[PDB]
Design a binder for this molecule. Structure first.
Ligand SMILES: Cc1cc2nc3c(=O)[nH]c(=O)nc-3n(C[C@H](O)[C@H](O)[C@H](O)COP(=O)(O)O)c2cc1C
Ligand code: SF4
Ligand code: SF4
Ligand code: SF4
Ligand code: FES
Ligand code: FES
Ligand SMILES: [Ca+2]
Lengths: 905, 156, 146
């Protein structure tokens, strides 16, 4: 199209509204109620521009730019006096009841309302009457509530209800007494309640975890990183102050996690600030855990490895590509073992084979929202890959969007979208051992054991295409439901099959692969998504290695007398007794870790590794996209005796000391080159981010904002002499003010969004090419593998029915967003949000044992009896028993396994 | 501790098949609970949400949006005197002063024994016979401050 | 309903129609058409912006039209006593009659019916009969509070 803004010609998209078209061009228009993801409602009355009918018009007409489409030849004015007077008046009306709270408000310096008050030029108050006040509700441990600061812009209710699909946040009252919150006191039950701290333009919803140890946005040292709490790999901005990780802000990625994270990845960062973490290397001599610096620890470790007959290495899916590869070089690729069990590794390798050899295009997380039918097989998406569940909700509302678009309604008229789309929505068929959080919008939910879920998928694949292996033993009404699912998937333009490794069944993955292949063979634009468990599970699968059982047999037989455990607690993937016995038999245990685990008591040496906040590296997400995360802060800047190095740095210097008897603290780009030389299937991680020589017109990228304060006084209590600015030889970033964070800088790794006049999270509008689109100069991250030309073949191994045998109980995994990822359970703010460990039972099974709800029953697995209180699950099937995966004592490896001696305590 | 009765649930269902959307019976269900108890307690919002299927936030927003659905407990009889423009021309101020002298309360407050609750209301559709005062089933018109004690003593 | 005027098979026409009465809950904004549609659906009575329009997507997205009581009561006269006769009632740009009256400190408040073109003074001293004793005409407001 063509618009005339103050006489200047501009070329914009004709389908866009005028506010987003003018914001894409860099023009500044105040706005509150419009969000790029939530659509438009036109409440705040802030985006007024004067539109003219033709080229020569004097009076014009004041119009709302978030309702006005950017049609061809549209003449508007922004800076003329009438529009500025109206926008200043609207800001003034918002400022009548606003509390005098900016010094004691967590949004100060990060406030959209402050930015728009300053931008409109309104600074003189002529209101002398009283201001309305509101009582503050309790929203739980994550979100702090303060309703005095609200401007009634309706963004919270729009996001939480329409977008996030929540049910316990609403607007109450009329006129100026509108109240936004829950009907009563309680925790916000949505898994994406944390995004309200960025959706809300004011300080109504604030980060309570940040509020405990609060600092302003200009004082925060930011870095671009990847969230380490599940396999989705949402881009984040961890920001620190005074040596502790303070906040996790959302980092815009137009491909993955544009405006939204989940609650686990926003509030589960508290394990970094734990005081029991190893900070210096520790050697156990006799029973004395003495403390070394880096050099003597490396020398002694290299010696004690040098007179050992065989050294094995147990990596982890928590660790990065570089650290696992450095361990692989240290011990040799024959003696390198992945830290996961055999069944988990089999499921992970099958998921990788489906992704990179199945011939079906795996979609990006932003691209999930543009699919017409979703079949989720076996994966509890909301509890394991929650952001994928949010994107699935968007794809389900896509039917209402399409129905509105068929009747001359644009995509930003979300009110008309919901008016036309009353209750019609895209088909969603979720399958699990119990009820999920997607069942409120799902067209069908199938509660069945994982064998029966796999059989459902196999029957769907056979009904879609007769070349798939058939299933015998389908009940007729279940067959009618298969026909309904097949009719929904066949009529869809873009179907999407979502599975993963969390179900604990290979056959569900095989069934999802066969459904995707059958839909591909009909000519549909089918996509397949696979949810892995940990942050770098796909990278560990691509790198490969032996399973944990092989390493345990090597330690127990005596062929290996030296074990190097990299960032693995070893109890989540194997039984505790076997791991403890194997590590007790081994005369040399060396744990390279950043979290105090149970295996460090048996460890002979502990290398204090760094977490994601104090290290760089590359992680591969569930879609196969390599993503680089950078160090946020130097740990030794505040505590000089802290020796907390990168895991790959520790292992590379250990290998160098073992070989040539000197320490070699390498550079990250050297390890990247070693990975892309030794491992050609990981050769794409070089393009994930540019190397340390990357500059923007000669200068590096600044970690901290321009107004970083206190630099001559933040360490003055230790010494009045200012220390060294920490030098970053690994990355293109600097630990200082002196860098570049321009929105027009030719770069993709943006540490934080800030623009002059835009201090809120709305500065991402300045950092994007067009608002709500991609990051300018491309989104960061690169896919490792392309879609294969030829696919796989149909998996003929159709599993049998689940037969409940007496005395044996099938463990059904019940994942929790707060409690399954180990590092998140380490966080102290998650210990109040997580539920108490309850064992889930069928009513028929509870009647058979004669136990009621809440009774403590004991069960013995691997020779250890543990007691749990019983919760009655109606959606479970008979012969199964529900257990919470990931909690203390209940490893996620227990999923899909039998359980013995289920009796009342 | 709340439980919808069989009669209230039957009335809510009977209102529910009138419309094609169970959400459309939310206002009438709230009015049914209002008639059968006098006010809408905290558990009633959750009960209406459970019966209808809509979330409790929607029912709470509907109950708090409308002025004639009471969420706080009131007395046995409510007083809803018109304070709009025509009744202001007719002089509702004397009626309000007489009511505040008799009941010894404030508009919006209730009596100590729960005998009456003093409230203003919107237009009552009785401008030609203003001022008007709305009690539970009666629309008293041609109000005078001398007749307020005579009118308030016939309700117990 | 007991006379067959509503429901099925209305005097052999075959047109199916049924009417239900929904009582309000005391809010002035419910009178607006889009807000009436929103309050009929059971939500908070918030108006809807144009576009869209309630003639296309009204109640629950369906075609829905809302008419006043006076319009729906003037419809039978237009339909039964002819169209050109209804045009020959008031000789002005507006055709038809209107319910009219005065209220507030007048001698005879009430409601009458007047054709278009009637001056406002003709209700003061004729139908209302003027005001009470010792009252001067300071102001008047024709169309209610808005
Ligand atoms: C704020 C507002 C309040 C209204 N209240 C009423 C009302 O109470 N009763 C009524 O019959 N019309 C009311 N109307 C008018 C109609 O709702 C609507 O605007 C339209 O004029 C109806 O056209 P009609 O006369 O053909 O029915 C109101 C209009 C507005 C803008
Ligand atoms: S929300 Fe913004 S304007 Fe309001 S008190 Fe906080 S910083 Fe100030
Ligand atoms: S609480 Fe925040 S997001 Fe919600 S209406 Fe108020 S200012 Fe807007
Ligand atoms: S969905 Fe996973 S990767 Fe994304 S924020 Fe949540 S825990 Fe982190
Ligand atoms: S942004 Fe347009 S009125 Fe709110
Ligand atoms: S103004 Fe009071 S009844 Fe109408
Ligand atoms: Ca580093």
């Amino acid at each position: 199209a063509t618009i005339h803004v103050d006489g200047k010609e501009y070329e914009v998209n004709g389908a866009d509204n005028l506010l987003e078209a003018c914001l894409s061009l860099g023009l500044d228009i105040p706005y509150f109620c419009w969000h790029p993801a939530l659509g438009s409602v036109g409440a705040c009355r802030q985006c007024a521009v004067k539109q003219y009918q033709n080229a020569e018009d004097t009076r014009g007409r004041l119009v709302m730019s978030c309702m006005t489409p950017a049609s061809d030849g549209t003449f508007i004015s922004i800076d003329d006096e009438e529009a500025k007077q109206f926008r200043e008046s609207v800001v003034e009306w918002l400022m009548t009841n606003h509390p005098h709270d900016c010094p004691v408000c967590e949004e100060g310096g990060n406030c959209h309302l402050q930015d728009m008050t300053v931008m409109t030029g309104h600074s003189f108050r002529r209101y002398r009457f009283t201001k309305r006040t509101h009582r503050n509700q309790d929203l739980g441990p994550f979100i702090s509530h303060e309703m005095n600061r609200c401007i009634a812009c309706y963004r919270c209710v729009r996001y939480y209800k329409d977008y996030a699909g929540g049910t316990d946040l609403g607007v109450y009252g009329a006129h100026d007494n509108v109240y936004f919150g829950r009907p009563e006191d309680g925790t916000l039950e949505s898994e994406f309640s944390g995004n309200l701290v960025e959706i809300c333009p004011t300080g109504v919803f604030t980060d309570k975890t940040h509020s405990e140890r609060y600092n302003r946005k200009w004082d925060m040292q930011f870095a671009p990183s990847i969230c380490q709490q599940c396999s989705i790999g949402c881009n984040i901005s961890p920001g620190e102050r005074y040596g502790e990780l303070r906040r996790i802000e959302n980092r815009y990625n137009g491909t993955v996690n544009h405006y939204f994270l989940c609650d686990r990845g926003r509030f589960g960062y508290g394990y970094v600030n734990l005081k029991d973490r190893p900070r210096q290397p520790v050697q156990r001599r006799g029973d004395d855990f003495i403390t070394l610096n880096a050099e003597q620890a490396m020398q002694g470790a290299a010696d004690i490895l040098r007179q050992s007959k065989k050294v094995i290495g147990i990596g982890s899916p928590r660790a990065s590509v570089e650290s696992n590869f450095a361990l692989r070089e240290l011990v040799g690729e024959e003696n390198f073992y992945t830290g996961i069990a055999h069944g988990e590794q089999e499921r992970l390798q099958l998921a990788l084979k489906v992704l990179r050899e199945g011939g079906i295009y795996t979609p990006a997380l932003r691209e999930i929202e543009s699919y017409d039918a979703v079949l989720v097989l076996g994966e509890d998406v909301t509890q394991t890959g929650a952001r994928v569940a949010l994107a699935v909700r968007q794809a389900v509302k896509g039917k209402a969007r399409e129905m509105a678009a068929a009747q001359k309604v644009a995509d930003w008229q979300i009110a008309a979208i919901l008016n036309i789309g009353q209750r019609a929505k895209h088909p969603l068929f979720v399958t699990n051992v119990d009820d999920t959080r997607l069942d409120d919008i799902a067209a069908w939910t199938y509660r069945a054991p994982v064998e029966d879920q796999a059989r459902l998928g196999f029957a769907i694949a056979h009904a879609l295409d007769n070349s798939a292996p058939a299933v015998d033993g389908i009940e007729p009404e279940l067959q009618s439901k298969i026909d309904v699912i097949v009719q929904a998937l066949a009529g869809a333009k873009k179907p999407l099959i979502i599975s993963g490794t969390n179900a604990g069944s290979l056959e569900v993955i095989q069934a999802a692969a066969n459904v995707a292949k059958a839909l591909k063979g009909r000519g549909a634009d089918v996509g397949i998504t696979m949810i892995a468990r940990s942050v770098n599970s796909m990278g560990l699968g691509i790198m490969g290695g032996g399973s944990l059982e092989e390493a345990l047999t090597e330690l127990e037989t005596g062929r290996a007398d030296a074990v190097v455990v990299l960032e693995n607690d070893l109890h989540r993937h194997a039984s505790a007794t076997r791991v403890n016995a194997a590590l007790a038999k081994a005369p040399l245990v060396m744990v390279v870790d950043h979290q105090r685990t149970a295996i460090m008591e048996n460890a002979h040496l502990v290398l204090s590794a760094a977490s994601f906040a104090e290290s760089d590296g590359t992680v591969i997400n569930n879609e196969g996209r390599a993503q680089r995360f950078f160090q946020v802060y130097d740990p030794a800047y505040y505590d000089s005796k802290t020796v907390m190095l990168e895991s790959w740095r520790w292992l590379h210097s250990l290998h160098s000391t073992l070989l040539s008897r000197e320490v070699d603290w390498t550079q990250l780009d050297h390890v990247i080159d070693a990975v892309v030389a030794k491992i050609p299937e990981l050769a794409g991680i070089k393009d994930a981010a540019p190397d340390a020589t990357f500059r923007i017109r000669g200068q590096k990228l600044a970690r901290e904002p321009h107004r970083y304060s206190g630099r001559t006084a933040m360490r003055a209590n230790i010494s009045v002499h200012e220390p060294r600015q920490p030098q970053d030889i690994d990355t293109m970033f600097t630990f200082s003010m002196e860098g570049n964070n321009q929105p027009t800088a030719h770069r993709s790794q943006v540490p934080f969004a800030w623009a002059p006049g835009w201090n809120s999270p709305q500065a991402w509008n300045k950092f994007q090419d067009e608002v709500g689109g991609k990051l300018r100069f491309g989104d960061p991250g690169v896919r490792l593998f392309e879609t294969s030309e030829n696919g796989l073949d149909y998996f003929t191994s159709v599993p049998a029915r689940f037969q409940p045998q007496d005395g044996k109980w099938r463990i059904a995994p019940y994942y929790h967003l707060f409690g399954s990822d180990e590092l998140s359970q380490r966080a102290p703010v998650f210990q109040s949000r997580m539920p108490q460990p309850y064992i889930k039972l069928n009513p028929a099974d509870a009647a058979k044992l004669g136990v009621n709800a809440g009774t403590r029953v004991s069960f013995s697995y691997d020779g250890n009896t543990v007691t749990l209180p019983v919760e009655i699950a109606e959606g479970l099937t008979a012969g199964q028993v529900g257990l919470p995966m990931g909690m203390s004592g209940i490893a996620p490896v227990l999923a899909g396994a039998h359980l013995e001696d289920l009796k009342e305590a | 501790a709340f439980e919808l009765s069989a009669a209230e649930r039957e009335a809510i269902e009977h209102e529910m098949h009138h419309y094609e959307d169970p959400r459309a019976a939310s206002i009438e269900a709230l009015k049914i609970v209002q008639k059968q108890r006098g006010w809408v307690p905290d558990g009633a919002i959750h009960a209406i949400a459970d019966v209808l299927g809509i979330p409790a936030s929607d029912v709470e927003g509907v109950a708090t949006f409308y002025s004639q659905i009471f969420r706080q407990p009131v007395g046995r009889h409510v007083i809803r005197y018109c304070d709009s423009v025509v009744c202001h021309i007719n002089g509702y101020q004397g009626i309000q002063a007489a009511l505040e002298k008799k009941l010894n309360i404030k508009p919006g407050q209730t009596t100590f024994d729960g005998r009456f609750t003093l409230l203003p209301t919107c237009c009552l559709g009785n401008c030609d016979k203003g001022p008007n005062m709305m009690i539970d089933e009666d629309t008293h018109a041609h109000l005078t401050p001398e007749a307020i004690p005579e009118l308030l003593e016939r309700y117990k | 309903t007991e006379a067959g005027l509503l429901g099925k098979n209305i005097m052999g026409t075959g047109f199916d129609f049924e009417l239900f009465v929904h009582t309000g809950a005391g809010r002035y904004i419910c009178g607006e058409e889009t807000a009436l549609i929103n309050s009929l659906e059971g939500r908070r009575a918030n108006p809807r912006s144009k576009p869209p329009f309630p003639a296309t997507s009204g109640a629950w997205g369906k075609p829905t039209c809302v008419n006043n009581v006076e319009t729906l009561c003037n419809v039978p006269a237009i339909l039964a006593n002819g169209v050109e006769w209804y045009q020959n009632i008031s000789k002005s740009k507006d055709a038809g009659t209107k319910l009219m009256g005065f209220s507030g400190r007048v001698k005879n408040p009430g409601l009458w019916e007047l054709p278009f073109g009637t001056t406002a003074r003709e209700i003061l001293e004729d139908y209302a009969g003027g005001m009470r004793d010792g009252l001067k005409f300071k102001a008047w407001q024709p169309g209610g509070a808005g």
